[PDB]
Ligand binder design. Structure first.
Ligand SMILES: O=C1c2ccccc2C(=O)c2c1cc(S(=O)(=O)O)c(O)c2O
Ligand SMILES: C[As](C)(=O)[O-]
Ligand SMILES: [Cl-]
Ligand SMILES: [Cl-]
Ligand SMILES: [Cl-]
Ligand code: NA
Ligand code: NA
Lengths: 108, 122
């Protein structure tokens, strides 16, 4: 399966931005347990969300996960400058995990 | 307080094997799965597999089943990943990442990563 994300998105501070995660096989479902992980410069990874909508501990509440139409979505409500990073989504396919190609978020 | 310390950069010859480490600390080792992930430039992220430090049960990405061997050492709270029959396709940054798997499945803490360079001796 191929997992697709927006290549790059631009937002401004204090705005709301939504990143998406598409599955080549069909609609994303709760059974794909969508994860979202954040990579910051210097190869600094941080898990944000798992199982579509559950946040890992210590993750800012402005990050929320859901399913929008056929896709898994990561919404950042009130973008912060420190949110500038690369966001990877990953989908579970009944025995293995697939990562999307990542979305580079730029905050103006 | 939770920390995942991976071993230093590695330089190995093609055809050889290598064993990477991931020292866990600041939590109960056996309570969380440990995943291994592969990062190459322009190739995003690739899932290698996960190990359950409790019983050492594993799950692999098909593509890595003949490539990677995951193990743990409870006493030292360390997860290892061995990579065999190395080729230049194995050059990458490798991470260990812990996962909570009760009621949901999410990664939280990730190691700083270990760089592997598969290089021929001149
Ligand atoms: O659902 C998941 C999952 C969801 C999201 C990210 C990662 C995983 C995952 O890594 C995993 C899962 C299920 C199984 S299960 O069938 O064995 O219980 C596993 O063995 C396993 O490793
Ligand atoms: C600790 As590493 C930068 O080899 O990316
Ligand atoms: Cl993958
Ligand atoms: Cl990317
Ligand atoms: Cl070895
Ligand atoms: Na992408
Ligand atoms: Na990338």
């Amino acid at each position: 399966a191929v997992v697709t994300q927006e290549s790059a998105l631009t937002t401004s501070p204090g705005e709301t931005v939504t990143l998406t995660c598409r599955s080549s096989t069909g609609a994303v479902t709760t059974s794909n347990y969508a994860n979202w992980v954040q990579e910051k410069p210097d190869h600094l990874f941080t898990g944000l969300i798992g199982g579509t909508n559950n946040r890992a501990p210590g993750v800012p509440a402005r990050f929320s996960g859901s399913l929008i139409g056929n896709k898994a979505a990561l919404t950042i409500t009130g973008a912060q400058t420190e949110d500038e990073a690369i966001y990877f989504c990953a989908l579970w396919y009944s025995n293995h995990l697939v990562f999307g190609g990542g979305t580079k978020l730029t905050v103006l | 307080e939770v920390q995942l310390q991976q071993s230093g950069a590695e330089l190995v010859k093609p055809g050889a094997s290598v064993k990477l480490s991931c020292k866990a600390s600041g939590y109960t080792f056996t309570s969380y799965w440990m995943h291994w992930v592969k990062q190459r430039p322009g190739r995003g992220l690739e899932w290698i597999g996960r190990i359950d430090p409790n019983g050492g049960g594993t799950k692999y990405n098909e593509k890595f089943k003949s490539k990677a061997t995951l193990t743990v050492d409870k006493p030292s709270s360390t997860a290892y990943m061995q990579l065999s029959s190395l080729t230049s396709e194995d050059s990458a940054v490798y991470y260990c990442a812990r996962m909570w798997y009760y009621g949901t499945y999410y990664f939280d803490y990730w190691g700083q990563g270990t760089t592997l360079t598969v290089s021929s001796a001149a």
